[PDB]
Amino acid sequence: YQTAPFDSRFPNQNQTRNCWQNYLDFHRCEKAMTAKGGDVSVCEWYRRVYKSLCPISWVSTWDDRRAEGTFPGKI
Amino acid sequence: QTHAYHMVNPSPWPLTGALSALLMTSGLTMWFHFNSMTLLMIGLTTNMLTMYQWWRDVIRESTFQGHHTPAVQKGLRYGMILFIISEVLFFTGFFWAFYHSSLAPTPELGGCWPPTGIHPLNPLEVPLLNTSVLLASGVSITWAHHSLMEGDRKHMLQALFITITLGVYFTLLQASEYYEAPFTISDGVYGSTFFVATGFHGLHVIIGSTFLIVCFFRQLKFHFTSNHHFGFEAAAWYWHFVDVVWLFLYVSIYWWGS
Amino acid sequence: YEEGPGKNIPFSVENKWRLLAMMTLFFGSGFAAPFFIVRHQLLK
Amino acid sequence: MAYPMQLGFQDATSPIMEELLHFHDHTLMIVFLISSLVLYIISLMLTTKLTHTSTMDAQEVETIWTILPAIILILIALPSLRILYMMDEINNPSLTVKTMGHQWYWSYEYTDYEDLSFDSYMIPTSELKPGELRLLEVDNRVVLPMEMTIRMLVSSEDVLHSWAVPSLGLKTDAIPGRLNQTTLMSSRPGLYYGQCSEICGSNHSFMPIVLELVPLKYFEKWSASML
Amino acid sequence: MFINRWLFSTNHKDIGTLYLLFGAWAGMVGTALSLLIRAELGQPGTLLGDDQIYNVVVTAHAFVMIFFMVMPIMIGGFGNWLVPLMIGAPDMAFPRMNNMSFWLLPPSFLLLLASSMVEAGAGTGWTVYPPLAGNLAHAGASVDLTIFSLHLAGVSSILGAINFITTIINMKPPAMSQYQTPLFVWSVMITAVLLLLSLPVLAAGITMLLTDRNLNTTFFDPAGGGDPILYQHLFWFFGHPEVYILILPGFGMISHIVTYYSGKKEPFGYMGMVWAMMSIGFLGFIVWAHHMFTVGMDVDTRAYFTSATMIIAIPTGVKVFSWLATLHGGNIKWSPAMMWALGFIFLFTVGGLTGIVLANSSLDIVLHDTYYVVAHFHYVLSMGAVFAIMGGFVHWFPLFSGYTLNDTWAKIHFAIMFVGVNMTFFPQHFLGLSGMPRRYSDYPDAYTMWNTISSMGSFISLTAVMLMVFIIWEAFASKREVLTVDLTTTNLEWLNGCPPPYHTFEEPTYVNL
Amino acid sequence: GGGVPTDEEQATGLEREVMLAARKGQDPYNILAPKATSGTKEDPNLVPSITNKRIVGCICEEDNSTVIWFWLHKGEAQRCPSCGTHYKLVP
Amino acid sequence: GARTWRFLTFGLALPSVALCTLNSWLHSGHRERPAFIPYHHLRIRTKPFSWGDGNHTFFHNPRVNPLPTGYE
Amino acid sequence: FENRVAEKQKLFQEDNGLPVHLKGGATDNILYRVTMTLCLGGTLYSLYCLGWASFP
Amino acid sequence: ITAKPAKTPTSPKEQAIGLSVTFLSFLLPAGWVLYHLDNY
Ligand code: HEA
Ligand code: HEA
Ligand SMILES: CCCCC/C=C\C/C=C/C/C=C\C/C=C\CCCC(=O)O[C@H](COC(=O)CCCCCCCCCCCCCCCCC)COP(=O)(O)OCCN
Ligand SMILES: CCCCCC/C=C\CCCCCCCCCC(=O)O[C@H](COC(=O)CCCCCCCCCCCCCCC)COP(=O)(O)OC[C@@H](O)CO
Ligand SMILES: CCCCCCCCCCO[C@@H]1O[C@H](CO)[C@@H](O[C@H]2O[C@H](CO)[C@@H](O)[C@H](O)[C@H]2O)[C@H](O)[C@H]1O
Ligand SMILES: CCCCCCCCCCO[C@@H]1O[C@H](CO)[C@@H](O[C@H]2O[C@H](CO)[C@@H](O)[C@H](O)[C@H]2O)[C@H](O)[C@H]1O
Ligand code: CUA
Ligand SMILES: [O-][O-]
Ligand SMILES: [Cu+2]
Ligand code: NA
Ligand SMILES: [Xe]
Ligand SMILES: [Xe]
Ligand SMILES: [Xe]
Ligand SMILES: [Zn+2]
């Protein structure tokens, strides 16, 4: 892994939804793996991609809101 | 003169109108920033006085003095059509804002429309009733128009009274729905689009209802002839405009946006 | 109303020196205003 | 960077900036020729005592004056749109870097592997080292590997800014709540300068961008040393 | 009598006179602002202060030049004076509403000057983009006063547009079709349609900005799911038509001036000139996002906006070529008005061509928010719109006043202004290509030579503006009364004498079929 | 079901003058385009006026965009300076 | 004619309004308000409102409109 | 109601040189004076408010 | 255009006074502000 590859779902200058989708996918996967006490290593691809693309302040804000119970996306 | 056009007496109302606009805008500034309503209340008062005297004088010039030749009436027809077009483009800006926000919901909303935490109104309850009310008022105003052309004073008055009653019903229902709504203008772009677009529409309903009430009193005073009644035509065109904007709001914001 | 040259205007041209003063005050006030607004903003 | 008395573009540092120089040369020739022809025809219309003041038929001549401009516009649009789509083409970047605009400085985030981020502020004129450039130097440069395709993502944490590096042909608006992408590839090592390119308040003039382009191995060690 | 005549007017000529006096005063304000810009930039370093005071001056410069100088002079002034006379009409359709279009402007201007006096002013750019223009980064009353200034100017122009369209459609002689009206009358009708459609969209957008600032809406605030880029679309949907609104009445006056001083009875290719103005007006609504090539829109959208924008060159070229074909074979009178018009044809062409450069989104990446854009728009505004205003002013001053200018002084004025505007703006092309950004109070040292020369040019333009005031004074001071005007057979506005009586066409013209 | 006035009953001022003149096929307020004669010296276009001069605009040929404007004075017929069409003032 | 538009007013338009009035009437009465969650995209406060205590919307309904801190 | 339009036509066509905004009689002058007094007074007040708001 | 001779001719001296007064009305107030910037 070097950086996040081209994703045909997000081919344009606006990459906002690419960051968002990968953050959601990581957290959904993590919840699915921890519930059964499965393994969060299967979620690693989404983690690397959102960490590469997402501004630190966006991740930090979203993490705070998940802890607060105010995150508006479905996980 | 040997043309048919109206040379208007020198008038103070353009200046009182312009100054009322200064007092309203500087008044809103003073209300938003300096915690005071005084300038705004002076501006609203001078604006209403200006409108009253200006349109009073148009009635004097037409009904009482006979300056509204067919050429003058044709000009007024164009002016009212052009005014309505400008109002359509004003609403177009709000519909653009609505579609922009709702077709591409941002992450802050949950990336969905309606946003997470918004509970829209049921479009089949009061919003559907409001739709029936404005459509019904489009039928009754058409009855009023045909009664006036056919020379029937009693039926013109009854149909126009029904039209005004429906406009008032719509306004009272919308006031109640504003009070009952579980979302507010501060509930993100959902509240912003909903209240500003429906709010400007509600203001236009009040303006159009007022114009119809002016027509109702002028009819009671026998101002209209069976062939000459441009104030009534203009009020009817304005009222159809208000109906049509409502149908676009209903389909866009209340139904498709729910 | 008065018709004809020098009469279809809201300012008098009866005296060229009074007119110079009036034009000086009129154009001069417009040109000066931004300098005095800058001075006002700098002095806060 | 720009140099004194400069007339045209900064020398191209990237292949796309090279393409833009050749496209501008072609377009400027057309601007020169049309401007020149209009001035010449004005001077021709105005330099004869011969007259013809009766009604003149327009339709034949209007064909020339619509078709020839239509053909000129197509000759501009073709290479214009080839370059537009070349920049937009899928390139596979090796590295992603984020920049966040702020009043009045840039932050940079290199988060492919480790949590590297820092702020980049203008060097005050009174603190410039001898030979350094007024209003252009920063404390912490944007170190990047040369000869590599880099994905730059641009946003803001306050008002609009715009992240520009003229010699690489780059200008991407920095919009809060939006992540704008562009690609950067330097043909050469060195220092490449830009300036905030959206009005952002009191110090819009004073939040520059400096890229430092070096070999991958130097970039890797710098990255490690900045954690 | 004075109050009845000048505060209570229902007369198209006196209202036109009020607009020309207002626009002249506004021009002095806008000139002072332009000199403050060039004083700040005329040597490296800081003169006034940081970018806030600087961009308050830049923002006010643009609003004053556009909304208080060009629009009032071209539409309110020339349009009110000339349109009724050119169609033989006894006044405007709505002579009392006309007076309200005028009297809204002093209050609009007062709100703009209040914006600059309270807090730290509105240092936003004339585009007023959020979030810089929002209630966090511009807290306090300045931006709200700017928004209300725009509301009153917009109502003024919307009601004026309703008035002009109605007058031009409804009040021609019954034999006169739309294809027998002069080109200036066409230029005003098309400008009026653009105003009617564009200003309400600006009204919606700045109203949204007002509610974001004061009622906790979030149209443009991502925290609420809004988008700063939505504001830019609403603004520019108005803003591109607005630049056509600024030049179209100029195009109309240029057609009349070139025809008149070529000794011709008619412009070359009348129907082509009508077609070109309607085509420019239409295309002017479908190109706005060429102001947004760096915001991150999709490549196919950039391709469309590039192509649609370049199309405007075709009808515009027909007008330039038709002006040249009007000169062709003329008995040329080298009047001061003709010099303004010839300068217009050339300098407008240069600015239109740098616009075609900017239409190329790929090249616009590097030119956007640089002085290349500033050079483009000052060629079309400070040498196009302004040259058309000066040509129309010196051509029609004797009609309006009944007095002549000193033609030698007016030629001196033209020569000084021609040198000053070219010295000011030509070097800004180099500053843009080499990367100098817009809305900067100071620049890296490399940009010093061209900024120095540009500022020197601005002072030459100031000298021209001061001389113009003296030249108007000298005309009213000397009182040379007009006797005979040539070519009245094809210039109806002159046929009632100089100045025309308060009431003209009380008996309409006779035109048979 | 009556009680609405008619224009015949209630029209007043200039509106009423236009209405009554139109009933008589007359056009004192110039609402209609006058129809041309052959425009020869024997059969000039007759131009009504309430004074001793009136502006004529001559559309010399159908679909000309250029209108030729001139003052027509009481007295001998005058000619359009572009096409020579004759006009005679009838004050 | 007038007769036809009166027929449509009383025969179609007002019956429609009566039926929709009935529909709304039958679906009136309060639904249970949802759990308060202090979502950051709702209850926006970038500037105090120019009335009341600055924190209440213009047609504030205490029963269904929570403040930023929750229901009153 | 009775049709009194003819009586208002006579009043507003009286040859008394009054402009239409004053031709109704003494009530028109009063409402004109109230309107212009509020406008001009309000405008002077708006200028005072600018003076006040122009300083901290 | 043709025109009558001036009803109130403006001599070269009178023109120098008008031009001087006009230029001073622009230059003195702006010059006063710009001279005093440091003071502000
Ligand atoms: C009068 C005002 C005016 C006019 C008429 C124009 C006319 C044009 N403008 Fe301009 N423009 C502005 C005022 C004007 N502009 C302003 C104020 C801005 C900045 C806004 C801001 O950000 O503040 C601006 C910005 C602006 C931009 C945005 C640049 C950026 O911000 O990055 C672009 C992009 O395409 C553009 C293009 C054009 C084009 C293609 C025309 C065309 O209409 C020109 C057409 C004319 C010709 C081409 C010349 C004559 C034709 C011929 C002789 C025929 C032959 C020609 C060819 C074959 C090419 N202009
Ligand atoms: C009509 C529009 C117009 C006109 C004429 C001008 C004229 C001038 N402009 Fe400007 N300018 C703008 C519109 C205009 N400008 C706009 C829209 C911007 C962008 C703002 C922003 O970035 O937000 C701008 C920005 C701008 C900048 C860029 C600022 C920056 O990016 O930091 C500069 C820099 O030199 C400049 C300078 C000047 C100068 C020196 C003149 C001189 O040429 C002016 C000289 C004087 C005149 C031309 C006379 C004017 C008066 C009359 C014609 C009155 C006539 C009287 C009668 C008829 C009686 N202006
Ligand atoms: C039956 C409905 C009729 C509407 C009447 C209501 C109020 C008066 C104003 C009406 C004008 C319309 C729109 C103006 C903007 C916003 C109001 C929108 C409608 C409304 O009334 O919205 C309310 C908020 O009002 C608020 O903020 C109130 C804010 C009051 C001040 C308004 C500021 C005016 C804005 C300036 C207008 C500019 C005009 C532009 C002209 C263009 C010229 C070119 C909603 O209440 P809430 O408690 O948030 O939610 C309900 C919860 N139970
Ligand atoms: C609480 C809300 C407060 C806000 C303020 C606005 C409120 C209310 C305004 C209501 C509008 C009332 C208009 C009354 C017009 C009366 C004059 C009239 O109707 O005049 C008629 C002419 O029409 C004409 O001028 C036509 C004139 C048309 C004007 C219509 C304008 C709509 C105005 C909207 C203004 C604000 C909108 C902005 C919103 C963003 C007269 O000709 P006739 O009828 O043929 O009569 C002659 C016959 O008798 C001869 O036989
Ligand atoms: C025809 C002529 C036109 C009429 C002009 C009339 C001018 C009279 C205005 C009265 O002045 C008022 O003074 C109040 C206090 O002195 C202010 O109250 C406000 O400011 C107070 C601050 O002391 C606070 O109590 C509140 O914010 C609020 O009451 C209020 O803003 C202001 O208008
Ligand atoms: C962009 C438009 C401006 C362009 C440049 C204007 C050209 C300047 C015109 C003259 O302006 C004056 O200059 C004086 C100095 O020459 C100043 O006097 C100042 O300086 C004098 C010399 O030190 C003192 O005697 C005075 O008291 C002192 O006020 C004076 O105030 C100022 O009005
Ligand atoms: Cu940051 Cu400009
Ligand atoms: O706006 O070009
Ligand atoms: Cu544009
Ligand atoms: Na500087
Ligand atoms: Xe070009
Ligand atoms: Xe403005
Ligand atoms: Xe507006
Ligand atoms: Zn003829």
Residue numbers in the entry:
A (entry chain H): 11 to 85
B (entry chain C): 4 to 261
C (entry chain L): 3 to 46
D (entry chain B): 1 to 227
E (entry chain A): 1 to 513
F (entry chain F): 3 to 93
G (entry chain G): 12 to 83
H (entry chain J): 1 to 56
What does the paper say about this structure?
pmcCytochrome c oxidase (CcO), a terminal enzyme of the respiratory chain, catalyzes oxygen (O2) reduction coupled with the proton pump, generating a proton-motive force across the membrane. Mammalian CcO consists of three mitochondrial DNA–coded core subunits (subunits I, II, and III) and at least 10 nuclear DNA–coded peripheral subunits. The electrons from cytochrome c are transferred through CuA in subunit II and heme a in subunit I to the O2 reduction site, which consists of heme a3 and CuB. It has been proposed that the hydrophobic channel that connects the transmembrane surface of subunit III through subunit I to the heme a3–CuB site is the O2 transfer pathway.
To identify Xe-binding sites in CcO, we treated dimeric CcO crystals with Xe under the following three conditions. (3) Fully oxidized CcO was treated with Xe under an aerobic environment. Using these crystals, we measured the X-ray diffraction data at 1.8 Å resolution. The anomalous peak height of Xe5 was about 80% that of Xe2 and was significantly lower under aerobic conditions. Xe7 was in the cavity formed by the terminus of the heme a3 side chain and the transmembrane helices (helix IX of subunit I and helices I and II of subunit II) at about 8 Å from the transmembrane surface. Xe8 was near the molecular surface on the intermembrane space side formed by the transmembrane helices (helix III of subunit I, helices I of subunit III, and a single helix of subunit VIIa).
